[PDB]
Design an enzyme around this catalytic site. Structure first.
Site, PDB file in Angstrom:
ATOM      1  N   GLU A   1      -4.184  -5.394   0.948  1.00  0.00           N
ATOM      2  CA  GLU A   1      -4.270  -6.230  -0.032  1.00  0.00           C
ATOM      3  C   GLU A   1      -5.342  -7.181  -1.066  1.00  0.00           C
ATOM      4  O   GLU A   1      -5.334  -7.802  -1.786  1.00  0.00           O
ATOM      5  CB  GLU A   1      -3.467  -6.154  -1.371  1.00  0.00           C
ATOM      6  CG  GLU A   1      -2.730  -4.641  -2.231  1.00  0.00           C
ATOM      7  CD  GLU A   1      -1.728  -4.388  -2.511  1.00  0.00           C
ATOM      8  OE1 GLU A   1      -1.339  -5.919  -2.716  1.00  0.00           O
ATOM      9  OE2 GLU A   1      -0.985  -3.508  -3.217  1.00  0.00           O
TER      10      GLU A   1
ATOM     11  N   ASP B   1       0.865  -1.632   0.113  1.00  0.00           N
ATOM     12  CA  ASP B   1       0.069  -0.295  -0.128  1.00  0.00           C
ATOM     13  C   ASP B   1       1.110   1.034  -0.009  1.00  0.00           C
ATOM     14  O   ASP B   1       0.196   2.890  -0.142  1.00  0.00           O
ATOM     15  CB  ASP B   1      -1.092   0.027   1.578  1.00  0.00           C
ATOM     16  CG  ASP B   1      -2.360  -0.459   0.956  1.00  0.00           C
ATOM     17  OD1 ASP B   1      -2.367  -1.013  -0.504  1.00  0.00           O
ATOM     18  OD2 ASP B   1      -3.287  -0.866   1.610  1.00  0.00           O
TER      19      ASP B   1
END
Ligand SMILES: [Mg+2]
Ligand SMILES: [Mg+2]
Length: 174
Positions: free
Chosen positions: A112, A16
């Site tokens: 994710e 991220d």
DNA sequence: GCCTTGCCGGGTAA
DNA sequence: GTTCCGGCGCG
DNA sequence: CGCGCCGGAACTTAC
DNA sequence: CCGGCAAGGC
């Protein structure tokens, strides 16, 4: 303490955020460790004190910055030391021990993963990274497959078999 | 006949 | 997610 | 003069 | 990231 939190943070960074070596109008530079996140609350409450813990343990003197952007918040540490600490750890990822593997996979999934838990999936453009994780999961007795999930952007998916749902959730998440 | 999972299109959250 | 911009301090 | 921390955010796209 | 579709096996 340090190894586990490091691997977890690297997980978040890889997925991220990122690791950036910058060059500015002559001949300045910057080294950045970054994690971005929609929730400012999650950054302040959960992520930042873990980063702060690591910074203190490594005697990094840089501060944690939290910068507001259009679409997300950015956790950022400007530190040549912290930058190489993570970049070197990333290069040596294949040597991770079990505690580190589990922490790293956990980071990956928080950032994710299929958060709905109806399906257990991890997305990433880096097939090679998923294949490492795939091997780790097999040794933990979690069966999984990797396939090109998106032909548009070259994004692969690592799907964890629901036959090993319980073992995954309890080993990695809880 | 139900579950799993490959496939794929839209679209926020990186 | 990435790399532009503008600052500042330091030898 | 060369390098490295600080604070911002426009720009681009992987999940 | 999400979530609908459907094709492949017990
Ligand atoms: Mg990513
Ligand atoms: Mg995320």
């Amino acid at each position: 303490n340090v190894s586990g939190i490091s691997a977890y943070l690297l997980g978040l960074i890889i997925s991220d955020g990122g690791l950036y070596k910058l060059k500015y109008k002559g001949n300045r530079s910057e080294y950045r460790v970054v994690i971005t996140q929609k929730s400012e609350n999650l950054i302040k409450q959960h992520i930042a004190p873990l980063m702060q813990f690591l910074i203190d343990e490594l005697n990094v003197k840089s501060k944690i910055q939290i910068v507001k952007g259009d679409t997300r918040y950015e956790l950022r540490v400007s530190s040549k030391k912290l930058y190489y600490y993570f970049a070197n750890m990333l290069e040596r990822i294949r040597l991770f021990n079990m505690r580190e593997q589990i922490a790293f996979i956990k980071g990956l999934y928080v950032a994710e993963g299929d958060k709905t838990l109806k399906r257990l999936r991890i997305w990433n453009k880096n097939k090679a990274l998923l294949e490492i994780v795939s091997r780790w999961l097999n040794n933990l007795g979690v069966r999984n497959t990797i396939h090109l999930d998106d032909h548009r952007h070259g994004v692969y998916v690592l799907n964890i078999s629901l036959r090993d749902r319980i073992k995954f959730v309890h080993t990695i998440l809880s």
